[PDB]
Amino acid sequence: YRYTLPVKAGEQRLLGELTGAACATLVAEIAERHAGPVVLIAPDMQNALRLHDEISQFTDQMVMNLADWETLPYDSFSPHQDIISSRLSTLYQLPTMQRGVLIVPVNTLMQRVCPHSFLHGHALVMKKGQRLSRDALRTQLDSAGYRHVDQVMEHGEYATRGALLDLFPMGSELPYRLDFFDDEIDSLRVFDVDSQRTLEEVEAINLLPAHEFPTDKAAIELFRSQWRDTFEVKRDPEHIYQQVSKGTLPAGIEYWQPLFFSEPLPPLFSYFPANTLLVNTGDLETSAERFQADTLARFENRGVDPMRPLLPPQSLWLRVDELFSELKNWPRVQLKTEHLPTKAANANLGFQKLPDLAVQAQQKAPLDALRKFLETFDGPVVFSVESEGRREALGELLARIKIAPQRIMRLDEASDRGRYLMIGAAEHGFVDTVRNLALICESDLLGERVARRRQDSRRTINPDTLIRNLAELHIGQPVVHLEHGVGRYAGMTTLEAGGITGEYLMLTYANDAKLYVPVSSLHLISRYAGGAEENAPLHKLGGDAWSRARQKAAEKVRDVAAELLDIYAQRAAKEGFAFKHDREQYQLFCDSFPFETTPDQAQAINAVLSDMCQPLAMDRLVCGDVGFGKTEVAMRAAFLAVDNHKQVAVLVPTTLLAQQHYDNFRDRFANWPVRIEMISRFRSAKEQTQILAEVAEGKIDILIGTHKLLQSDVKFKDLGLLIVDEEHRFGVRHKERIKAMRANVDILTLTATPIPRTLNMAMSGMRDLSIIATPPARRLAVKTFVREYDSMVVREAILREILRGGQVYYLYNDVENIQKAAERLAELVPEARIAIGHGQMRERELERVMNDFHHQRFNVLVCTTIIETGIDIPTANTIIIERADHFGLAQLHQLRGRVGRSHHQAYAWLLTPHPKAMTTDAQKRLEAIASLEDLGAGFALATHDLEIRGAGELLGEEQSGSMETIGFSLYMELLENAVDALKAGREPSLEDLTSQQTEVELRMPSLLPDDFIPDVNTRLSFYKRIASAKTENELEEIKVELIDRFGLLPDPARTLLDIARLRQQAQKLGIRKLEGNEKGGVIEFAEKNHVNPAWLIGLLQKQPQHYRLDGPTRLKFIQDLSERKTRIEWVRQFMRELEENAI
Ligand SMILES: Nc1ncnc2c1ncn2[C@@H]1O[C@H](COP(=O)(O)OP(=O)(O)O)[C@@H](O)[C@H]1O
Ligand code: BEF
């Protein structure tokens, strides 16, 4: 083309006049036309990710990025070993590959690596036709460094179960099972982390060492030798020398890598193929050197703590001059967006930048510049769309500009006068003047719409995965056995206690008195919820305290049972309501919203709209973190409410945020004809009466106000929608007082963080719940600083935000000394313009200075906790508090996250009085809030607050209490028992808990042996599932799953399955208790059985000696069933024949 290609160690090519996103075009071109692999060096790893898209967007050659360590140099955490997988694979094949593009940032090119002899000297291949021992391969894996686990879920672990060994290779992404057979590899089956069954069988597998360093005995001794040669040992049970010598691995041990090879580690340059070409963008002569400075700076910063010392930086990272010399050994190309006219191997190819093409909604012709420029472009114009649906979203836009470009795949496909489009993540369009090509990106006109996972992958907390993290069976966590009391779970054990070895779950009580409970009676154990995992009560066994507490609870539930019998339903007398939504009308309202919702916001919208469309009323928690645009869900709910004209009301515990919602709703409905108004202290009673009259006649649909409505004064013609914000700070019977008016109203519970009782109820599932863990695009984190009382940090932070041009939120929490403090901090900060705010003011100047804050005429505001509700403006970007000894975690997090709603990094300066003046609980609160600082932190903080404040009375008042109440589920058990007492009118009795659906014990061992399943959690899960079976199809699929996950089925397993099947069939039949032994047994029916009495008596008289009706419902039979198989077959055929003549 316009230039040659550089192939020489010293050859350097330099290219200029290269606009943004044309670097990708040039890179793809040269890689496709370069006879050899391509390695690209990027200045910023994040930028490299961007490259990883656009390159793959424009070409089809395999493009990969060097997996890199996430942690900062000399950190105290592992590199998140999963990433290591993606690394090692690329390392293993790296020498042997001809075409392909590998992209690396300089910060990781700076890092030393393994010698690859260590790598491919340990690179095993397992093949079908191999007579290899299970144990030999086991020890082989152990030497390789794979970790022995029992429920493999991650990279680099292996588990065993009888003849079935399974593991996860470090190179591939899916684990594998083997199915050994006579020490022969019979199968090699891939299986998902959650299917635990075959997806397919592959002929052979290749596996790589577990880590980036050996871990055999030779490795340990070499490491110890190097250590004793270099550093100084400390005789200590956590000094990494002793910890390594023990056998384990320190968390950060990966940074002490050069102590494992007795060699200078390669600079990774040896791994380049014999014929490569370096291509470089930006510049390294600043990035690499600044990185070296940062590494040494952090090193010297942490040159303390003799336990866990640090290597010199030069031993692990390279030198800059050495890096330059090394790169001068390969041909290299450099790209920059400047003018280099001198002289050869240096060109300036026409890649003009995109002109100012954009769309303006206010203009009558948004695509004015677009249509002006399209017709002035003689060449083809090709658009790029980052997704699929958006393509149509822009095709309609092209219909507004009356053009239908054809979708192409490659840039060369463009004709002379051709308009086209393609799916790509390109950022900036441009004008390739070489052949007059116009490339257009979405941001060219749309602007900023970013949906990538900008946040760190590890920096995420899934709510459902947090519940599934564990809900049972932690070896120390407490549980409650309703018969006796509360203890700590300790595990499983098999016991021979009557000639049949049965499983038993063992609990421990006070004074170390153990209690084993049979596995079958599992439904008598509840997971503790009193929230005292470290200070919980420990009932001493055989005491009356638990019985007394249970009797008190029984009395309380009987009282509330009468109360519910007043309603004559289990909160079920309600029929609800159905809303009608017009999809086009709602879509029009979506159009009136000038934003794009996050995916979880869209999910919440779908859930709420569907639920209201259902003919039942809602009680739905939308508990997401602040700054997630929760209010817009309410806006759309109110729009659909006014579509039905259902007189929606809204509640908030303040006047500031009430006014905020008022103006927001006015903005949403300044185009839609509908009446929005407010009723609170600000309004005069003269107009409050008018508001009440208007809402009595129904001329008002949207009302915003505080507790004035729940004063038996407001009248609604048709109250159909009620909204509540910030459920916290609300006492009980507020919701009951607002519910009393109309039962079938849709309840929408908006909040930022639930109080412990509400959170526990959400966990119970009795109330609908929803979480939005998807922050807006530009909502970066909020910095937090827990500092002691310094008068200078506050002043300098105030000045830092003033020079930024923002507003400071000053918290002192006083209505007397706030006056003096305002002038005190004015003297401290003469540059500051301050207003005084407190809730004990006439509210006229309050709203006036709120308006002033909207205009930002004064910078820092002193206020009490009325600020907590929050009307945050994006201008405000910093909060300094004064009292940090008494504030709830919910308030702390809420005021932390209240700042932002903008692209600019906010701040949260936290001022504390003397540490010794702090009580223990204050220290715990402050250390907890400091420990967590990231997006999606409110929900996890609420989970932590659970077990701290403790869920309160699930029945009585005073929520969020840590009293000694019975757990959660037992309350529901007694409630349904009393509902039975009401429906059947039966007497209250503590016997329904002592339940018995069907007992089919026959003195025959039946259990899931631990050898057949290693762990206990899965064993108990299957125990519960089998106990709660409903049809023989369930049993069949369970048997299939057991076959998959654990191979063959032991005799006890088969017996358990068939006993469950027989219990199922007997429950279908109508018999309740079928018992027996070797010499015979008894059959006992129900009150209304379905066995034919005629033939029943016929059998009775046919063989009275072998059959005797001894009791109103008891049939005694004698049988010589010395074989378990004979016993089971006899009973099966007996019951089958009995039910054959079923009446
Ligand atoms: N997906 C989004 N992208 C950009 N900005 C958003 C998004 N969602 C919300 N916002 C902005 O952030 C602000 C959040 O205010 P609000 O609805 O009160 O959030 P929260 O109720 O969580 O405090 C809104 O005023 C809105 O303008
Ligand atoms: F209700 Be929010 F957090 F604005």
SS (H, E, C) 877-943: EEEEECCCCCCCHHHHHHHHHCCCCCCCCEEEEEEECCHHHCCHHHHHHHHHHHHCCCCCCHHHHHH
C-alpha 350 – ligand 2 centre gap (Å): 51
Nearest ligand for residue 627 CA: 1
**Cα(531)–Cα(1048) distance, rounded to whole angstroms?**
42
Residue of 623, 625, 630, 664 with the most ligand 2 atoms within 8 Å of its CB, for mutation: 630
DSSP state, 180?
A: B
Integer angstrom CA distances of residue 316 from 73, 108, 749: 10, 12, 55
Question: Strand 807-811 to strand 876-881: parallel, antiparallel, or no bridges (unpaired)?
Answer: parallel
Question: Strand 176-177 to strand 1071-1076: parallel, antiparallel, or no bridges (unpaired)?
Answer: unpaired
SS3 assignment, position 673: coil
Cβ–ligand 1 contact at 631 (below 6 Å)? yes
Distance from the first to the final alpha carbon of the chain: 92
Q: Is 633:620 a contact under the CB 8 Å cutoff?
A: no
Q: What is the CA radius of gyration of the chain?
A: 36
Residue 909 pairs in a beta bridge with 785, 880
Sequence-separated (6 or more) residues with CB below 8 Å from residue 659:
678, 682, 847, 850, 871
Taking alpha carbons only, the member of 378, 381, 379, 362 closest to residue 370 is 381
Integer angstrom CA distances of residue 480 from 517, 579, 942: 12, 44, 24
**Cα(530)–Cα(947) distance, rounded to whole angstroms?**
7
Place of tokens 């206010």: 362
The single-letter code of the amino acid at 92 is: Y
Helices (H), 421-522: 463-467
Residue 276 is encoded by which pair of tokens? 């490569």
Taking alpha carbons only, the member of 11, 18, 2, 9 closest to residue 281 is 18
DSSP state, 352?
A: E
Residue 130 is encoded by which pair of tokens? 């191999």
Residue 455 is encoded by which pair of tokens? 């946040």
Cβ–ligand 2 contact at 626 (below 6 Å)? yes
User: Phi/psi class of residue 492: alpha, beta or left (left: φ > 0; alpha: ψ in -120 to 50)?
Assistant: beta
DSSP string, 1094-1141: HHHHHHHHH-TTTEEE-SSSEEEEE----SHHHHHHHHHHHHHHHHHT
Residue 624 alpha carbon, nearest atom of ligand 1: 22
Cβ–ligand 2 contact at 725 (below 6 Å)? yes
**Cα(170)–Cα(156) distance, rounded to whole angstroms?**
5
- The coordinates were experimentally obtained by cryo-EM
Taking alpha carbons only, the member of 854, 803, 814 closest to residue 836 is 814
Residue 777 alpha carbon, nearest atom of ligand 1: 3
Taking alpha carbons only, the member of 46, 50, 118, 79 closest to residue 271 is 118
C-alpha 598 – ligand 1 centre gap (Å): 10
Integer angstrom CA distances of residue 555 from 548, 551, 984: 11, 6, 19
Question: Strand 721-724 to strand 702-705: parallel, antiparallel, or no bridges (unpaired)?
Answer: unpaired
Q: Is 1118:1080 a contact under the CB 8 Å cutoff?
A: yes
Q: What are phi and psi of 545, to 5 degrees?
A: -60, -45
C-alpha 727 – ligand 2 centre gap (Å): 11
Residue 1031 CA, chain-centre distance (Å), reads 34
Nearest ligand for residue 869 CA: 2
Residue 299 is encoded by which pair of tokens? 């090193």
DSSP state, 714?
A: -
Place of tokens 């935000």: 801
Residue 574 is encoded by which pair of tokens? 């309600």
E-assigned strands of 282-375?
A: 332-335, 346-348, 351-353
Nearest ligand for residue 634 CA: 1
C-alpha 627 – ligand 1 centre gap (Å): 5
Q: How many CB atoms are closer than 10 A to CB 107? A: 22
∠ Cα 86 89 93 (to 5°) = 145
Helices (H), 529-678: 545-567, 583-592, 599-613, 630-644, 656-668
SS3 assignment, position 506: strand
Residue of 596, 600, 631, 635 with the most ligand 1 atoms within 8 Å of its CB, for mutation: 631
DSSP state, 317?
A: B
Nearest ligand for residue 629 CA: 1
Q: Is 714:698 a contact under the CB 8 Å cutoff?
A: no
Q: Is 38:277 a contact under the CB 8 Å cutoff?
A: yes
Q: Is 897:626 a contact under the CB 8 Å cutoff?
A: yes
DSSP state, 875?
A: T
Nearest ligand for residue 628 CA: 1
Taking alpha carbons only, the member of 319, 294, 320, 287 closest to residue 44 is 287
Cβ–ligand 2 contact at 414 (below 6 Å)? no
The single-letter code of the amino acid at 757 is: R
Residue 860 pairs in a beta bridge with 808, 834
E-assigned strands of 756-841?
A: 768-769, 782-788, 807-811, 834-836
**Cα(977)–Cα(988) distance, rounded to whole angstroms?**
8
Cβ–ligand 1 contact at 463 (below 6 Å)? no
Cβ–ligand 1 contact at 960 (below 6 Å)? no
Residue 831 is encoded by which pair of tokens? 């540059």
**Cα(456)–Cα(297) distance, rounded to whole angstroms?**
25
Sequence-separated (6 or more) residues with CB below 8 Å from residue 1037:
none
Q: Whose alpha carbon is nearest atom 26 of ligand 1?
A: 629
1113 CB-contact burial (10 Å; exposed 0-12 / middle 13-18 / buried 19+): middle
Residue 625 alpha carbon, nearest atom of ligand 1: 22
SS (H, E, C) 558-571: HHHHHHHHHHCCCC
Residue 347 is encoded by which pair of tokens? 């060109």
Residue 1109 pairs in a beta bridge with 1115
Q: Is 871:726 a contact under the CB 8 Å cutoff?
A: no
Q: Is 637:612 a contact under the CB 8 Å cutoff?
A: yes
Q: Is 723:638 a contact under the CB 8 Å cutoff?
A: yes
Q: Is 146:71 a contact under the CB 8 Å cutoff?
A: no
Taking alpha carbons only, the member of 155, 152, 142, 39 closest to residue 87 is 155
Taking alpha carbons only, the member of 286, 290, 314, 310 closest to residue 300 is 310
**Cα(197)–Cα(1045) distance, rounded to whole angstroms?**
6
CA atoms within 13 A on the CB side of 660: 19
Cβ–ligand 1 contact at 789 (below 6 Å)? no
CA atoms within 13 A on the CB side of 9: 7
Cβ–ligand 2 contact at 31 (below 6 Å)? no
Place of tokens 């039975």: 980
**Cα(51)–Cα(1120) distance, rounded to whole angstroms?**
79
Question: Strand 189-190 to strand 200-201: parallel, antiparallel, or no bridges (unpaired)?
Answer: antiparallel
C-alpha 128 – ligand 2 centre gap (Å): 61
Q: What are phi and psi of 39, to 5 degrees?
A: -120, 125
Q: Is the dihedral of CA 216, 218, 221, 226 positive or negative?
A: negative
Cβ–ligand 2 contact at 870 (below 6 Å)? yes
Residue 897 alpha carbon, nearest atom of ligand 2: 3
Q: Whose alpha carbon is nearest atom 2 of ligand 2?
A: 626
The single-letter code of the amino acid at 1019 is: R
The single-letter code of the amino acid at 372 is: K
Question: Strand 1071-1076 to strand 768-769: parallel, antiparallel, or no bridges (unpaired)?
Answer: unpaired
Q: How many CB atoms are closer than 10 A to CB 542? A: 10
Place of tokens 């200070």: 535
Q: Is 78:251 a contact under the CB 8 Å cutoff?
A: yes
Cβ–ligand 2 contact at 752 (below 6 Å)? yes
**Cα(896)–Cα(941) distance, rounded to whole angstroms?**
12
DSSP state, 234?
A: -
Q: Is 878:801 a contact under the CB 8 Å cutoff?
A: yes
Q: Is 50:427 a contact under the CB 8 Å cutoff?
A: yes
Q: How many CB atoms are closer than 10 A to CB 265? A: 18
**Cα(723)–Cα(751) distance, rounded to whole angstroms?**
10
Longest dimension (CA), the chain: 117
Residue 954 pairs in a beta bridge with none
Residue 898 alpha carbon, nearest atom of ligand 1: 23
Residue 626 alpha carbon, nearest atom of ligand 1: 22
* Whether residue 402 has a cis bond before it, omega within 30° of 0: no
Q: Is the dihedral of CA 320, 322, 328, 329 positive or negative?
A: negative
C-alpha 779 – ligand 1 centre gap (Å): 9
Helices (H), 614-722: 630-644, 656-668, 685-697
**Cα(438)–Cα(953) distance, rounded to whole angstroms?**
67
**Cα(727)–Cα(505) distance, rounded to whole angstroms?**
40
Residue 353 CA, chain-centre distance (Å), reads 41
Nearest ligand for residue 451 CA: 1
SS3 assignment, position 325: helix
Q: Resolution for this model in angstroms, one decimal place?
A: 3.5
SS3 assignment, position 253: helix
Integer angstrom CA distances of residue 873 from 513, 640, 653, 898, 903: 60, 28, 20, 9, 12
Q: Is the dihedral of CA 1058, 1062, 1063, 1068 positive or negative?
A: positive
C-alpha 725 – ligand 2 centre gap (Å): 8
Q: Is 750:723 a contact under the CB 8 Å cutoff?
A: yes
∠ Cα 1090 1092 1094 (to 5°) = 155
**Cα(897)–Cα(207) distance, rounded to whole angstroms?**
46
Q: How many CB atoms are closer than 10 A to CB 700? A: 22
Q: Is 90:67 a contact under the CB 8 Å cutoff?
A: yes
